[PDB]
Amino acid sequence: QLFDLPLDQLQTYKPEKTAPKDFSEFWKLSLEELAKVQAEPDLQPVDYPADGVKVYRLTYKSFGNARITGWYAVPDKEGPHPAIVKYHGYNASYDGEIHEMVNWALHGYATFGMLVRGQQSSEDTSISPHGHALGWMTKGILDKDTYYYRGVYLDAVRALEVISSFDEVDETRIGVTGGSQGGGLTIAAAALSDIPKAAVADYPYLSNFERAIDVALEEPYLEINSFFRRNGSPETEVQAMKTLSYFDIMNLAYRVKVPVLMSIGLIDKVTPPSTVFAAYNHLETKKELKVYRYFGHEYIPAFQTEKLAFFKQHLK
Amino acid sequence: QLFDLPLDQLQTYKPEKTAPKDFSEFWKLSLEELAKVQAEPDLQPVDYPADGVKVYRLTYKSFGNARITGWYAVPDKEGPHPAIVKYHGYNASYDGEIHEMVNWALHGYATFGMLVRGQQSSEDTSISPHGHALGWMTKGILDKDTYYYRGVYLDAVRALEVISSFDEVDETRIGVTGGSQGGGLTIAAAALSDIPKAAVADYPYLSNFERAIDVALEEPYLEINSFFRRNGSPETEVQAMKTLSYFDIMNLAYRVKVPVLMSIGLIDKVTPPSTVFAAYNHLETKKELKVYRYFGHEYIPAFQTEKLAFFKQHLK
Amino acid sequence: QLFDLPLDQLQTYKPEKTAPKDFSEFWKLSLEELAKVQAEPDLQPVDYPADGVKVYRLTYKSFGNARITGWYAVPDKEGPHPAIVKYHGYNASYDGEIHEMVNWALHGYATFGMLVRGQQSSEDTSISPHGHALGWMTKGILDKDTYYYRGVYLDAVRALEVISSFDEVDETRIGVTGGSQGGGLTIAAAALSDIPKAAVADYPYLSNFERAIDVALEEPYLEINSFFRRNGSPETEVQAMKTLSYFDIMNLAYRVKVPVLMSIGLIDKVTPPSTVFAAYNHLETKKELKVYRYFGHEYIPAFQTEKLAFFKQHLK
Amino acid sequence: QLFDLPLDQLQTYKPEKTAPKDFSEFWKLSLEELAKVQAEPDLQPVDYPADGVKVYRLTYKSFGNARITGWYAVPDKEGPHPAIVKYHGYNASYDGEIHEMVNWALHGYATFGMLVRGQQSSEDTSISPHGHALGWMTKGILDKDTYYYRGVYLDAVRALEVISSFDEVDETRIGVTGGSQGGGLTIAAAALSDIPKAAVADYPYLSNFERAIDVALEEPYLEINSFFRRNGSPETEVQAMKTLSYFDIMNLAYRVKVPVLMSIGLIDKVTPPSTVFAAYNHLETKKELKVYRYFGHEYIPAFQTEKLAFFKQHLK
Amino acid sequence: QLFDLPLDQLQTYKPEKTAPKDFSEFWKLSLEELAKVQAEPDLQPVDYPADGVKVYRLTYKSFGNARITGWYAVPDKEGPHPAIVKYHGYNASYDGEIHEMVNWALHGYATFGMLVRGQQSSEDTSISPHGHALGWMTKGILDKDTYYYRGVYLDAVRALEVISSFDEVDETRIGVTGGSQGGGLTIAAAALSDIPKAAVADYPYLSNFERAIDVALEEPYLEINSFFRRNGSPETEVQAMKTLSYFDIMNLAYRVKVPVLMSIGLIDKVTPPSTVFAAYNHLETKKELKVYRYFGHEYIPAFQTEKLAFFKQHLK
Amino acid sequence: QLFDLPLDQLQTYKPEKTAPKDFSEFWKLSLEELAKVQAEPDLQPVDYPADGVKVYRLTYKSFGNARITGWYAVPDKEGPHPAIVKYHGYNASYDGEIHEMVNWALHGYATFGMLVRGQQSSEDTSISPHGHALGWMTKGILDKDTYYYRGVYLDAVRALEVISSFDEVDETRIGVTGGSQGGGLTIAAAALSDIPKAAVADYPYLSNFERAIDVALEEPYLEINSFFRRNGSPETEVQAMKTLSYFDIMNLAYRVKVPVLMSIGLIDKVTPPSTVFAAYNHLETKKELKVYRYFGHEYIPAFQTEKLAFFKQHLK
Ligand SMILES: [Cl-]
Ligand SMILES: [Cl-]
Ligand SMILES: [Cl-]
Ligand SMILES: [Cl-]
Ligand SMILES: [Cl-]
Ligand SMILES: [Cl-]
Ligand SMILES: [Mg+2]
Ligand SMILES: [Mg+2]
Ligand SMILES: [Mg+2]
Ligand SMILES: [Mg+2]
Ligand SMILES: [Mg+2]
Ligand SMILES: [Mg+2]
């Protein structure tokens, strides 16, 4: 049941940004570190029991010389095609969602499902500099340069760069999408790259961290709480929250300049409604938030229609 | 974690059939009652945000003059096409799985998602003769003529009759599929109709009721137990179990004479592995059972590949 | 523990009525449909190991030609007797509570325990016109004429009509009582019939639906939520809530003209305190609400004393 | 769901008696200590809202000069009457079940609901000699002389002595009954006193302690386990089990020589079926055990009928 | 997660005292009853695998001639030594925490861990005058003179008296400490005895009872709620809360005249933050409350440092 | 409650070793890689509120140039001293257990609490080559060279090398200890190094992986199962199990040639008794296994005494 701010308060919830003074410089230097690594994209054809599509394993190199991979599915016909980069949930990829990628291609989109470094298939070359609570949320959290989501966000940008370089994709008709973690990555990618034409984010994660750790009732935001339990110095908490502020999509949101479609379920206890309204209310672009009273952190059939209609409009 | 018979015992588990002497005659007479109702199919176009497919709402008349309905999606190209009738889980259809139906059409199959009477969209004209435990499992359970699944099984047969009558479907290349309740309906359809060429049943429900009510740890087999708690006469329990034996797919399985592909997860607490192995082991036809150690009553990615390859082989 | 409005706010909680403009006409037409069915009451004597009482199975015909039944127990002595119609909880009858009915008779009341159509023993002839979430709460919810509780409320009225027709009952000394669903039926019956002399309702269900589905933390109000999950159109939700408004006892409450005794447990999560205070605060008749801080949705021993004292006063 | 020995093994389960060589002498000496305390019964009228019965608060003195009390209800008619002493569940009396006691009187029985010392209303003058786990189960468990149930069992015997001394009770027609702890007290009373003519014990507690602490899945047998965790010397465990063996009803059952009716639900996790079958199988007297597949540690409607019929037969 | 008053409201939460007019007289008479019992301390040496310490079982006589005991560990060197009396959690002593007592001695403190009468090792001679809910919280709760914590508080005072009488302890350098129940005992002892020089209380229990029973989400404050369920008269609740008021440390707090160090975890559901801030805010002495956002009712490593530093300062 | 093999079967449970033919060579080569990294130990004093001890933060370099650290506490007196290396539980170190380390020093032992790379304070320089399930258990599991526990086991060996090099430690009297993951590290250290004189392992983790993943009911063995769900190729499962067999302490145990003391609680659902008995039964050395019926995966007081007495005997 309902548990967060009531809808009327959610609609006006817009916390002050927490971006440090060197927020832009950190992202600039981070993109510059990415650019020093040659992508060297590699496509390996893959058998799949469906006609009308060609499937591949796509691998490229990214931040920290990390090998990143995923399924890439293309309509079996003359291009150029509209394209989608799809990002997945936290610890929530099962053999890379190949069937979903094929279905996207059958809807007419050349689609790459980036697999998140350290979670599924893709390599995380970044070390564990100081020890962390169980999970990825606090890996390297004592420094922006070492934080887990630095590499992840840069990988998400590189995925767009790679897909746009292909002859069979129409570089002008590329979308980004995903749910929860995948939703955060969607907003981060649109904030950090000119490439995407449109974005659809399902109940995005990695937003309004300061509120998230006080309101969430399930994992994985509570890993942050677990880390503070195990590393109890007051200074550690201040540093950790500062680090998180560089990756908080509510702080990246103002950079987004493409149309955005977003969902939230009002009984969602993983990505609490307030945290999602926070990101949405910091967007200054063509946008729409679809609110679903009786849904939580889960597939919403009605939003699937909205998502398909939105990409059909902006990408075809 | 593991809980049913160990694998080596599952593989040989073949309970004695519980079909009463008038089993066949019951079904013959039930099919005769269906035949008296003219199908009178009606198709209504649906505006759906996808190319390559035409989407409809299909409605027809069935047993007891009931109005049964569901989404029907068709490849947007000259037929005739291979076809699929897809059946859904107990209390588990959310606006009829329209998106899944479209995806099946984009994989090349004219596909109808039959919606189960009284659960989702479709009408259940059968009354509640005697009072039942919360749910549909014990609705009319005191008589085979009034039992809930009588009308459901007949609707499932009528769905095939209707689809195979369409000009754009290749009547010789029709598949049936579904999971849990949907898997039970798949097996029941193939057993009660010559129309299906092939069948894929995910962890089928409605099997080996006698063991199911003693071994299941989750709903909905346990509704039967709930009914017995509320209606405790010993004669009532015997009568209810005999009713159920007419619908038990382990008793119908000997009629199936098309290829069958089936799945089971070994930690499945809803449809316990033993109940699924019982239906499987009562099949005498080309068959395969895919066993997944680490999965329960849920989507199994690896099995979707097998499902697609199996329909590719038999319908194309 | 405490979870709803604090007591001081509960005592003044009186939501605006949600009755549509044709509320009275719908009930008038509904009672007229009931009157067209001849009751044809039938009494079958029953063995029971107690002296001083005569037990029967009573059956009568009601709305939609439905066969309704229950245990009827009478003091074994010359009448006429004061009488009680007792209504049961949702899915909560176990072989009709025969022992409780006998105890009521031994307290000197000719007592009939109406069994709810489709739940226990009694027949529900009303169909499932459109499909519903697991349970009875959303059966026929898209239309007042087809809604499950239409037949149920009319049955509850007919029970009074039948009991009052008996030579051995004093038609002027008839009470109604029940808990949760049985409590709602108690208030509905007193609202729809002149027959009852007094009413005792334990934490009544079927009240203030709009608040109920936002505040309840257990079944069965949440079936409504489940239905909206499975049938997601905005228009479906509006229609469903309109339908419910005709059956909402907070809307029927003003019709009650007999003394009413009511209970509420402040930690009740099934029938939340606010929903019960809502019904109570809409009564304009001799009334009393007994509030129990440390009880939830359960038998309250202290209220049993109050109930017995209340019926002794008004019916003897 | 099922969990103890299967039925066919329960039926023959007869653990070797664990009674120490001084078992009889302990009980003889304990009864001698009771006899030294003059009962000095006191009856105080109670205003209760029912006709046909007179209600009292009965108080008497027992083992250790303890003040034991409970409701005593009597038919409002010339006696002498058949009588019942009713015993209650562990920590499970709510204001002494006055309403149930009245109902027993209206069924024709002069009935006293003995309230257990230290649990409800009654005084426990026995000290806590050595410290115990949360609860009464391990209070004084290091010595048979100080153990909690010594005084309780003696109070239960004294309740019968007191009731049988009343002019209005037919001393030759006295029953004992109760469930769980109440069932254990029922068997213990019949074993320690010649006064009861008949006994009905619902799923009796305080049986086969050695198995109980290994098989029970719920409180309160598991208090014993909790005590052992808190007092881990091996000598302490041996001594505690030996203390318990003096009170284990499977060791007392061979003394019962009146008709016995007993119940067990096969999913009962509080008093596991094996523990109940052990007491039953140690009875050598007219006996019956009613087994209910679908019930646990709870009210069984069908068994109430058997209970009433059984007392009708033996007390009337 | 967070559940009580927000921190800013906690810091100013100071409920009106609930001490009856004869509060001081009751404690005066209670201490006078204690003084009539000669302590007769007895020390029995005990083997323990550690050098640098001497271990003993200490036993003394207290209120109601009760035998109270515990482990007493002394540095193996010439005294006099600073000393500590350590009090334990409710039902939370496992063989008296001998290892912890030895560690205190190895930190240089002659340390006695008083074991709570009736809970662990120590005798409770006080009777159960009226019956209580499962546990100790409502034992004797209908009268201040009979209430369980009367004897317990007096034992805690006597422990100080005994330890201060020893040649090897510096009577001027004695501390008291404990968690939850042990924390309440710490504050009660400092309120009732001049002996302690300093106090460290971890999230103290037995505070602000009126709020506790409305806010706590786990045992054992909810035993009070359980008692009111089983003993439902309004007068019983008033009496019980009056009794509790004499033992409420928020009422004893003003008597404390030594430095106090206290902890609270903001997600603590056993001793809710409000109840602990209530006691703290009623202290008028040198004091400090350490607040831990991410901890509940559990060991807090950072507070262990604070506790050690505090006793080192005040006792060495 | 009980759940693994019964005790009589545990005592003889000795699974066949799963060590591959290159087991020894793997470990020899791994130790050679460690040896190439110069330890370069650094001690930094820490202000701690206790007399009789000097506290430090110890840091050294290990496998993969990783910075490993922990608290090192030493008796404040002329050495040389007996020493202990203490290893901690999975994800279970809270600021490195500084207080426990001090207590070990006050018991006379120069004690270092090695903190596990990537879990607490210590650096894990090993990458995530292929993606893993949430946790460390499946990090690098597709290759023995990259697996998480390779570096951990080598750090544990290096901790001993470092401590034994200190002037104030008696190199001939060094112990190892720890629980669960810490117990597994204890056994692995004694197996891979001649330095330890004695070992005490509480309910050791990382044993008999093949059974563990089928019998464990709690985290963290079940991460392996989670990995298999997310990476379902049959070849992946075989490879992962073979990797694990290099680290399985039941395969290392045959190398341990110092006295061993071990514990197991029979209700332990984390490290099931069978997995612990398997490691124990593969020991060929002076050994003892203490079995605790009533305890699970938790602090066992009685075992601490055994632990202290055992180190007293072997190190002093
Ligand atoms: Cl890290
Ligand atoms: Cl029915
Ligand atoms: Cl319906
Ligand atoms: Cl005791
Ligand atoms: Cl008491
Ligand atoms: Cl990895
Ligand atoms: Mg190909
Ligand atoms: Mg190009
Ligand atoms: Mg008769
Ligand atoms: Mg008449
Ligand atoms: Mg000594
Ligand atoms: Mg002195």
Instruction: In whole angstroms, give the CA distance from residue A126 to residue D30.
Output: 76
Beta carbons of D2 and B214 less than 8 Å apart: yes
Method: X-ray
Dig out the tokens for A49 from the structure. Answer: 């029991």
To the nearest whole Å, the CA of E108 is away from the closest chain C CA by: 45
Answer whether E75's CB lies under 8 Å from E50's CB: no
Say which residues have a Cβ less than 8 Å from residue C25's Cβ, sequence separation at least 6. Answer: none
CA A197 vs. chain centroid, Å, equals: 16
* Rounded Cα gap, residues A83 and A176, in angstroms: 9
- As given in the structure block, the two tokens for residue E164 are 């201060």
Among F243, F182, F181, which Cα is nearest to F18's? Answer: F243
- CA B13 to chain centroid: 22
User: E interface mutation test: which of A138, A215, A221, A229 has the most E CBs within 10 A?
Assistant: A229
Residue B248 in 3-state DSSP? Answer: coil
Largest CA distance in chain B: 60
Chains that touch A (3 or more CB pairs under 8 A): B, C, E, F
Give the Cα separation of B126 and B108 in Å (integer): 36
Distance CA A305, CA A282 (A): 25
Rounded to 5 degrees, φ, ψ at D240 are -65, -45
DSSP 8-state secondary structure symbol assigned to residue D248? -
| Angstrom distance (rounded) from CA F279 to CA F191 | 12
CATH number of the domain that residue E255 is part of: 3.40.50.1820
Residues D259 and A240: their CA atoms lie apart, in Å, by: 74
| Residues E196, E200, E206, E208, CA torsion sign | positive
Query: Could you tell me the residue range of the domain that residue A33 belongs to?
Result: 1-316
Question: Do the Cβ atoms of C137 and C205 come closer than 8 Å?
Answer: no
Nearest-5° Cα angle at C164, C160 to C169: 130
User: Strand B42-46 and strand B53-62: pairing?
Assistant: antiparallel
Question: Nearest CA to CA, how far is D218 from chain B (Å)?
Answer: 18
Cα distances (angstroms) measured from residue F199 to each of F87, F104, F107, F247, F263 = 11, 15, 17, 18, 12
Neighbouring chains of C at 3+ CB pairs under 8 Å are A, B, D, E
Nearest to A294 among C216, C217, C228 (CB): C228
Angle CA(E76)–CA(E81)–CA(E86) in degrees, nearest 5?
Answer: 95
Q: Which residue has the tokens 């228009």?
A: C235
DSSP, res B70 = E
Q: Which of B217, B119, B186, B178 is nearest to B299 (CA)?
A: B178
Separation in Å, CA of C244 to nearest CA in chain A = 18
The alpha carbon of A167 and the centre of ligand 8 are apart by a number of angstroms equal to 5
Neighbouring-strand partners of residue C199: C176, C260
Q: How far apart are CA F40 and CA F51, in angstroms?
A: 29
Q: Which of E124, E202, E248, E268 is catalytic?
A: E268
Checking B138-145 for CB contacts under 8 A at 24+ apart, the result is B138/B223, B138/B224, B138/B226, B138/B227, B138/B240, B141/B224, B141/B227, B141/B240, B141/B243, B141/B244, B142/B236, B142/B239, B142/B240, B142/B243, B143/B243, B144/B26, B144/B242, B144/B243, B144/B246
What one-letter code names the amino acid at F132? H
Q: Do chains F and C touch (3 or more CB pairs under 8 A)?
A: no
Q: And the tokens for D64?
A: 């250790």
Which residues touch A216 (CB under 8 Å, ≥6 apart)?
Answer: A222, A269, A270, A271, A272, A275, E1
- A261 contacts in chain B (CB < 8 Å): none
Q: Are E187 and E219 in contact (CB under 8 A)?
A: no
Asked if residue B308 lies in contact with residue A49, where contact means CB atoms within 8 angstroms, the answer is yes
Residues 6+ away with beta carbon under 8 Å from D29:
none
Q: Compute the distance from residue E132 Cα to the ligand 5 centre, in Å.
A: 5
D203 is known to lie in a ligand binding site = no
Residue B21: both structure tokens together = 């002497």
3-state secondary structure of F169: strand
- Alpha helices by DSSP H, listed for chain B, are 7-10, 23-35, 98-106, 148-164, 181-192, 209-215, 222-230, 234-245, 249-252, 273-281, 301-315
Chains near D with 3+ CB pairs less than 8 A apart are B, C, E, F
Cβ contacts of A290 within 8 Å, gap of 6 or more? A261, A262, A263, A264, A302, A303, A306
Q: Which residues of F117-134 are buried (b: 16+ CB within 10 A; e: fewer)?
A: bbbbbbbbbbbbbbbbbb
Tokens for E180? 């939850």
How far is F169 from B83, CA to CA, in rounded Å?
A: 79
Query: Which residue of C lies nearest to A303 if distances are taken between CA atoms?
Result: C232
Q: Is residue E207 exposed (0-12), middle (13-18) or buried (19+ Cβ within 10 Å)?
A: buried
Whole-angstrom distance, CA of residue B173 vs CA of residue B83: 6
Task: Give the tokens for residue F161.
Answer: 């090398």
Question: Which H helix or E strand runs over F160?
Answer: helix F148-164
Helix (H/G/I), strand (E/B), else coil: D299: coil
User: How, if at all, do strands B42-46 and A287-292 pair?
Assistant: unpaired
D187 contacts: CB under 8 Å, gap ≥ 6: D199, D201, D204, D249, D252, D253, D256, D260, D279
Backbone angles phi, psi at E19, to 5 degrees: -60, 125
F74: Cα within 13 Å, side-chain hemisphere = 21
How many CB atoms are closer than 10 A to CB B96?
A: 23
Select the residue from B218, B229, B233 to test the D interface by mutation, using most D Cβ atoms within 10 A.
B229
Query: How distant is the Cα of F182 from the closest Cα of chain B, in angstroms?
Result: 25
Q: Is F49 close to E309, i.e. CB distance below 8 A? A: yes
C-beta atoms surrounding B284 within 10 Å: 11
Q: Which residues pair with B313 in a beta bridge?
A: none
Is-contact A264 A292, C-beta < 8 A? yes
Sorted by sequence, the CB contacts under 8 Å of residue C240 that are 6+ apart come out as C138, C141, C142, C224, C227, C228
| Alpha-carbon gap, residue C78 to D171, rounded angstroms | 32
Chain length of chain E: 316
Do the beta carbons of residue D267 and residue D274 sit within 8 Å?
no
Name which of F1, F2, F302 is nearest D232 (Cβ-Cβ): F302
If you write DSSP's letter for every residue of A222-247 in order, what string do you get?
HHHHHHHHHS--HHHHHHHHHHHHTT
Residue in chain E nearest F303 by alpha carbon: E99
Catalytic residues of A: 180, 268, 297
Distance CA E163, CA E74 (A): 11
Amino acid symbol at F229: R
Q: Which of C214, C229, C232 sits opposite A2 (nearest CB)?
A: C214
Ion ligand 3 contact residues with beta carbon within 5 A: C 128, 130, 132, 139-140
Cβ neighbours for E220, distance < 8 A, ≥ 6 positions apart: E90, E91, E135, E137, E270
Closest CA of chain B from C166, distance in Å: 26
What residues in C contact B233, CB-CB < 8 Å? 95
Among A94, A103, A316, select the one facing B103 at the smallest CB separation.
A103
For chain A, list residues whose CB is within 8 angstroms of any CB belonging to chain C.
1-2, 293-295, 301-302
Q: Which of E40, E67, E70 has the alpha carbon at shortest distance from E55?
A: E70
**Bond prior to E272 in cis (omega within 30° of 0):** no
Beta strand residue intervals within F138-272, DSSP E? 169-179, 198-202, 260-265
First to last CA, chain E: 39
Residue E163 C-alpha to ligand 12 middle, in angstroms? Answer: 9
Q: Give SS3 for B303.
A: helix
In a mutational test of the C interface, the residue from B128, B155, B227, B235 whose CB has the highest number of chain C CBs within 10 Å is B128
Contacting residues of C for A304, CB less than 8 Å apart: none
Q: How far is CA E314 from CA C297, E82, E161, E258, F99, in A?
A: 53, 10, 19, 10, 20
Q: What is the resolution of this structure in A?
A: 1.9
Please name which of A309, B78, B127 lies closest in space to residue C64, comparing C-alpha atoms: B127
CA dist B240 and B142 (Å) reads: 5
What is the three-state SS of chain C?
CCCCCCHHHHCCCCCCCCCCCCHHHHHHHHHHHHHCCCCCCEEEEECCCCCCEEEEEEEEEEHHHEEEEEEEEEECCCCCEEEEEEECCCCCCCHHHHHHHHHHHHCCCEEEEECCCCCCCCCECCCECCCCCCCCCCCCCCCCCCCHHHHHHHHHHHHHHHHHCCCCEEEEEEEEEEECHHHHHHHHHHHHCCCCCEEEEECCCCCCHHHHHHHCCCCCCHHHHHHHHHCCCHHHHHHHHHHHHCCCHHHHHHHCCCCEEEEEECCCCCCCHHHHHHHHHHCCCCEEEEEECCCCCCCCHHHHHHHHHHHHHHHC
Residue F264 main-chain phi, psi, to 5 deg: -150, 135
Q: How many domains does chain B have?
A: 1
Which amino acid is residue A282, in one-letter code? Answer: H
Alpha-carbon span C188 to F157, nearest angstrom: 78
Distance from C-alpha of F193 to C-alpha of F27, rounded to nearest angstrom: 11
User: Which numbered ligand comes closest to the C-alpha of C51?
Assistant: 9
CA distance F174 to F158: 14
Closest to E208 in 3D by CA, of E289, E287, E280: E280
Tell me the residue ranges of DSSP E strands in chain F.
Answer: 42-46, 53-62, 66-75, 81-87, 110-114, 169-179, 198-202, 260-265, 287-292
Instruction: Give the three-class secondary structure for A73.
Output: strand
Biggest CA-to-CA distance, chain A: 60
Active-site residue C297, yes or no? yes
Distance CA(F226)–CA(F239), nearest Å, equals: 15
SS3 (DSSP) at D189: helix
Q: Is residue D141 classed as helix, strand or coil in its secondary structure?
A: coil
Query: Per the structure block, which two tokens stand in for E216?
Result: 């706590």
Please give the sequence-ordered ranges of beta strands (E in DSSP) within chain D, or none if there are none. 42-46, 53-62, 66-75, 81-87, 110-114, 169-179, 198-202, 260-265, 287-292
Classify strands E66-75 and E53-62 as parallel, antiparallel or unpaired. antiparallel
State the SS3 of F249-273: HHHHHHHCCCCEEEEEECCCCCCCH
Considering CB atoms only, which of D95, D130, D132 is closest to E231? D95
Rounded CA separation E30/E18 (Å) = 19
Output the CA angle C142-C145-C146, nearest 5 degrees: 60
**B124 contacts in chain C (CB < 8 Å):** 127-128, 131
- Contact by Cβ (8 Å): A295, A268: yes
Query: Which residues of chain A lie closer than 8 angstroms to C215, CB-CB?
Result: 1
